[PDB]
Design a protein around this ligand. Structure first.
Ligand SMILES: Oc1cc(C(F)F)ncn1
Ligand SMILES: Oc1cc(C(F)F)ncn1
Length: 179
């Protein structure tokens, strides 16, 4: 397992990452990854059956989505904001546990559906979703990234990829990767 292996898995035959066709996708059952516009479109969110929104890019910058729990007050949607940045040096793994718990809590609900989003739905939000699949559904990093990629064109930055590899080794050694 290397970052290079994950880069390969994200590349088409031509050698290039792809780009999201849609504003969001269901990447695994009841887990959606998506962008700023779906997150701010409550009508769409209900048509999708969304009960929980995880903003993986909470903030005021151009690379952030400036929502909070209040935005969703009278919609009955449950919110969690994470102020993550999309850079190779940003420590997203510090957020994996709290993101994984929020997603587990949403899916524990019978008709629960969670949207994990950032601005483009390409790097932060898919990293959190992968790490969740590894830590709670016992999927190794290659199969977790493969399934998410099969359902949405994504490209986590190489820092995030490194952090998923580190996580993958820990889980492996802990015997936690066996579904
Ligand atoms: O039950 C499931 C299924 C999947 C997907 F891989 F099909 N992911 C997570 N939980
Ligand atoms: O948005 C997407 C992406 C893909 C991928 F497999 F290329 N398939 C279907 N819908």
């Amino acid at each position: 397992l290397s970052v290079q292996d994950l880069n390969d898995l994200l590349s088409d035959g031509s050698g290039c990452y792809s780009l999201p066709s849609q504003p969001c996708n269901e990447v695994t059952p009841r887990i959606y990854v998506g962008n700023a516009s779906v997150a701010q479109d409550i009508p769409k969110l209900q048509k999708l059956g969304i009960t929980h929104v995880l903003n993986a890019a909470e903030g005021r910058s151009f690379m952030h989505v400036n929502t909070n729990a209040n935005f969703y007050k009278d919609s009955g949607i449950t919110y969690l904001g994470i102020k993550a940045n999309d850079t190779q040096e940003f420590n997203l793994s510090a957020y994996f546990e709290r993101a994984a718990d929020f997603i587990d809590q949403a899916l524990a609900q019978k008709n629960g559906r969670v949207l994990v989003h950032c601005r483009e739905g390409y790097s932060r939000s898919p990293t959190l979703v992968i790490a969740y699949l590894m830590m709670r559904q016992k999927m190794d990093v290659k199969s977790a990234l493969s399934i998410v990629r099969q359902n949405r064109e994504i490209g986590p930055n190489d820092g995030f990829l490194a952090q998923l590899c580190q996580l993958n080794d820990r889980l492996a050694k802990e015997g936690k990767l066996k579904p």
